[PDB]
Design an enzyme around this catalytic site. Structure first.
Site, PDB file in Angstrom:
ATOM      1  N   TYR A  27       0.716  -1.364   0.005  1.00  0.00           N
ATOM      2  CA  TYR A  27       0.122   0.217   0.152  1.00  0.00           C
ATOM      3  C   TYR A  27       0.559   1.182   0.490  1.00  0.00           C
ATOM      4  O   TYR A  27       1.596   1.529  -0.001  1.00  0.00           O
ATOM      5  CB  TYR A  27      -1.230  -0.249   0.944  1.00  0.00           C
ATOM      6  CG  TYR A  27      -0.190   0.024   2.374  1.00  0.00           C
ATOM      7  CD1 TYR A  27       0.905   0.935   3.381  1.00  0.00           C
ATOM      8  CD2 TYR A  27      -0.599  -1.376   3.251  1.00  0.00           C
ATOM      9  CE1 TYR A  27       1.083   0.117   4.055  1.00  0.00           C
ATOM     10  CE2 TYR A  27      -0.605  -1.278   5.208  1.00  0.00           C
ATOM     11  CZ  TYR A  27       0.693  -0.409   5.347  1.00  0.00           C
ATOM     12  OH  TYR A  27       1.144  -0.421   6.399  1.00  0.00           O
ATOM     13  N   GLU A  90       1.077  -1.527  -6.463  1.00  0.00           N
ATOM     14  CA  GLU A  90       0.978  -0.667  -5.036  1.00  0.00           C
ATOM     15  C   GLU A  90      -0.306  -0.212  -5.200  1.00  0.00           C
ATOM     16  O   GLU A  90      -1.495  -0.398  -6.469  1.00  0.00           O
ATOM     17  CB  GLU A  90       1.851   0.769  -5.548  1.00  0.00           C
ATOM     18  CG  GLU A  90       2.915   0.653  -5.288  1.00  0.00           C
ATOM     19  CD  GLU A  90       3.473   1.020  -3.521  1.00  0.00           C
ATOM     20  OE1 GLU A  90       2.614   1.062  -3.072  1.00  0.00           O
ATOM     21  OE2 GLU A  90       4.362   1.319  -3.442  1.00  0.00           O
ATOM     22  N   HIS A 137       5.169  -7.663   0.931  1.00  0.00           N
ATOM     23  CA  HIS A 137       5.904  -6.861   1.875  1.00  0.00           C
ATOM     24  C   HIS A 137       6.119  -7.046   2.746  1.00  0.00           C
ATOM     25  O   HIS A 137       7.188  -7.250   3.152  1.00  0.00           O
ATOM     26  CB  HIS A 137       5.760  -4.986   1.483  1.00  0.00           C
ATOM     27  CG  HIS A 137       6.766  -4.613   1.161  1.00  0.00           C
ATOM     28  ND1 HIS A 137       7.083  -2.962   0.938  1.00  0.00           N
ATOM     29  CD2 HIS A 137       8.234  -5.116   1.113  1.00  0.00           C
ATOM     30  CE1 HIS A 137       8.609  -2.671   0.849  1.00  0.00           C
ATOM     31  NE2 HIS A 137       8.965  -4.064   1.269  1.00  0.00           N
TER      32      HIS A 137
HETATM   33  C1  LIG Z   1       7.279   0.795  -2.748  1.00  0.00           C
HETATM   34  C2  LIG Z   1       7.436   1.781  -1.605  1.00  0.00           C
HETATM   35  N1  LIG Z   1       6.307   1.498  -1.134  1.00  0.00           N
HETATM   36  C3  LIG Z   1       9.102   0.802  -0.843  1.00  0.00           C
HETATM   37  O1  LIG Z   1       9.009   2.670  -0.490  1.00  0.00           O
HETATM   38  N2  LIG Z   1       9.346   0.277  -0.977  1.00  0.00           N
HETATM   39  C4  LIG Z   1      11.342  -0.208  -0.479  1.00  0.00           C
HETATM   40  C5  LIG Z   1      12.020   0.088  -1.384  1.00  0.00           C
HETATM   41  C6  LIG Z   1      13.587   0.296  -1.672  1.00  0.00           C
HETATM   42  C7  LIG Z   1      13.870  -0.435  -2.661  1.00  0.00           C
HETATM   43  O2  LIG Z   1      13.613  -1.274  -3.154  1.00  0.00           O
HETATM   44  N3  LIG Z   1      15.034   1.005  -3.511  1.00  0.00           N
HETATM   45  C8  LIG Z   1      15.975  -0.132  -3.737  1.00  0.00           C
HETATM   46  C9  LIG Z   1      16.649   1.200  -4.016  1.00  0.00           C
HETATM   47  C10 LIG Z   1      17.632   1.020  -3.303  1.00  0.00           C
HETATM   48  C11 LIG Z   1      18.660   2.655  -3.246  1.00  0.00           C
HETATM   49  C12 LIG Z   1      20.066   3.051  -2.722  1.00  0.00           C
HETATM   50  N4  LIG Z   1      19.244   3.284  -1.473  1.00  0.00           N
HETATM   51  C13 LIG Z   1      21.213   1.610  -2.478  1.00  0.00           C
HETATM   52  O3  LIG Z   1      20.715   1.091  -1.425  1.00  0.00           O
HETATM   53  O4  LIG Z   1      21.138   1.010  -3.701  1.00  0.00           O
HETATM   54  C14 LIG Z   1      16.661  -0.535  -3.718  1.00  0.00           C
HETATM   55  O5  LIG Z   1      16.585  -1.373  -2.238  1.00  0.00           O
HETATM   56  N5  LIG Z   1      17.964  -1.553  -4.658  1.00  0.00           N
HETATM   57  C15 LIG Z   1      18.616  -2.714  -4.341  1.00  0.00           C
HETATM   58  C16 LIG Z   1      20.365  -1.885  -4.127  1.00  0.00           C
HETATM   59  C17 LIG Z   1      18.074  -4.227  -4.951  1.00  0.00           C
HETATM   60  O6  LIG Z   1      17.237  -3.607  -5.714  1.00  0.00           O
HETATM   61  O7  LIG Z   1      19.258  -5.043  -5.510  1.00  0.00           O
HETATM   62  C18 LIG Z   1      11.595  -0.199   0.474  1.00  0.00           C
HETATM   63  O8  LIG Z   1      11.278  -1.808   0.499  1.00  0.00           O
HETATM   64  O9  LIG Z   1      12.595  -0.111   1.381  1.00  0.00           O
HETATM   65 ZN   LIG Z   2       5.890  -2.127   0.377  1.00  0.00          ZN
END
Ligand SMILES: C[C@@H](N)C(=O)N[C@H](CCC(=O)N[C@@H](CCC[C@@H](N)C(=O)O)C(=O)N[C@H](C)C(=O)O)C(=O)O
Ligand SMILES: [Zn+2]
Ligand SMILES: C[C@@H](N)C(=O)N[C@H](CCC(=O)N[C@@H](CCC[C@@H](N)C(=O)O)C(=O)N[C@H](C)C(=O)O)C(=O)O
Ligand SMILES: [Zn+2]
Lengths: 243, 243
Positions: A27, A90, A137
């Site tokens: 959400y 979402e 999630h």
């Molecule tokens: C979609 C929303 N409700 C949400 O905020 N979800 C986040 C997603 C965060 C996410 O996936 N963010 C990406 C980019 C992060 C960029 C930077 N902060 C980093 O750590 O590299 C990631 O985690 N990507 C990683 C690198 C991956 O999937 O390999 C959560 O679970 O916390």
């Molecule tokens: Zn989430």
């Protein structure tokens, strides 16, 4: 004649499938225009957003062939870092609010569920995604994330054949199997791992195990999801299918 | 009256990248015709196959947007089950033969390396793959797999900017820091994990740790890859940069 790389594309392998192995449900915790702003300009993103209008609009924000940033630190069935191998969906919903009396949750509209079900069927068919791989999630990041939360209608998805759910009479049959005998913490840890959760295997009920029991309860026994082992939760760990 | 779920595509997120995060290198352990056969109908597959002709023909066997079946049980930098998030490249090469004097590998041809380097630069540029994530099967499955083996010319890739390698003089800087003192086994484990390897953290040199030390040696110190800790290997663990 001949420079450049010039590939030979005369052969294609029969043994291949989709990079997308999982669907993760979320959400937004916020209103629709703000939700769109965050998911388009805020360092997180998702493939689909389901609005709170009637009918509920489905917005495509990231192409399925691209990695959206929705799962973060995550694990399901031993697969870690799920962004690269998942589609994120979402749903516009306030999530929870903290109040002086306690933590309150906001329900999902029937229109959103009627948009979601056909969307999931379409994604699952195209990518060969089985019901055990359509998850929240909270399943992949227990303790850290609590979306889509205790009011999310998992049973509606199960009725449509999209997620696992105990078959009629099974919870009662498994409760009878246990016969009043609460299994030990190690057994709960073993069961949770079998279902796909990242969980310790220490036999000790610390916060990291409690959080996983609680995530499972929040999905299958949302009347109480404090992470305390009990007979009903043991029975669900046996009755919930893994397919 | 519908050809599928109706999607609104008015908006698009700035927060997205590729599902492909790694490139994994293999050898085939067999000749061209059987390599093509196995990788197209033998239960496994890879995206690219580099032949052993001159110049070397590159075959694309699986589209980059699809999951090929090349990595199996695997882990790099904490990411598991790497098929979904990798591109696999196989090189026609006989691998090794067992002899009473020990295991002996077959060299790669100049034409193959000359084909491989521009392919890697192309894939890496298109998918944003960083040098630390262009790795061998042996890196992601230490002990279980030994391809592309001790004759793979890693420094040639490094000279092209494709893989991490110590700067000139850095190995000497680090050997001096160590001052003839061999760090303990737990230190080796900690460094190997930092580099991306799945490795125990027990402080004990049992087969599982030895296999990881050996995989690292096979890549950066192929004169000896028996998995025994030594000062040279310690210096390399410090001198080989992260990323
Ligand atoms: C979609 C929303 N409700 C949400 O905020 N979800 C986040 C997603 C965060 C996410 O996936 N963010 C990406 C980019 C992060 C960029 C930077 N902060 C980093 O750590 O590299 C990631 O985690 N990507 C990683 C690198 C991956 O999937 O390999 C959560 O679970 O916390
Ligand atoms: Zn989430
Ligand atoms: C390509 C070749 N060099 C090779 O033999 N690689 C194999 C792995 C092959 C592989 O990835 N194989 C797939 C399963 C293929 C399914 C096939 N056996 C069938 O069902 O007919 C897999 O491990 N996939 C896992 C489950 C995944 O990536 O999630 C190895 O590392 O051991
Ligand atoms: Zn291999």
């Amino acid at each position: 004649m001949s420079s450049g790389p010039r590939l030979n594309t005369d052969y294609t392998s029969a043994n291949q499938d989709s990079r997308v192995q999982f669907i993760v449900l979320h959400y937004t915790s916020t209103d629709l225009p703000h939700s769109l702003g965050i998911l388009t300009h805020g360092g997180v993103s998702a493939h689909y957003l389901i609005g709170d209008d009637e009918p509920a609009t489905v917005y495509r924000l990231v192409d399925e062939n691209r990695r959206a940033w929705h799962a973060g630190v995550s694990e399901w069935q031993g697969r870690t870092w799920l962004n690269a191998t998942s589609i994120g969906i979402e749903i516009v919903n306030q999530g929870y609010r903290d109040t002086p009396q306690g933590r309150v949750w906001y329900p999902f509209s029937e229109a959103q569920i009627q948009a979601l079900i056909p969307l999931l069927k379409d994604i699952a068919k195209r990518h060969g995604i089985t019901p055990d791989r359509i998850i929240g999630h909270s399943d992949i990041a227990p303790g850290r994330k609590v979306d889509p939360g205790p009011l999310f209608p998992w049973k509606r998805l199960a009725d449509a054949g999209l997620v696992p759910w105990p078959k009629p009479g099974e919870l009662a049959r498994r409760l009878a199997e246990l016969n009043g005998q609460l299994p030990d913490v190690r057994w709960f840890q073993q069961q949770l791992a079998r279902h796909g959760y990242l969980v310790p295997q220490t036999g000790e009920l610390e916060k990291d195990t409690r959080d996983v029991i609680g995530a499972f309860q929040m999905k299958y026994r949302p009347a109480r999801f404090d992470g305390e082992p009990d007979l009903e939760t043991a029975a669900l760990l046996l009755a919930v299918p893994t397919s």
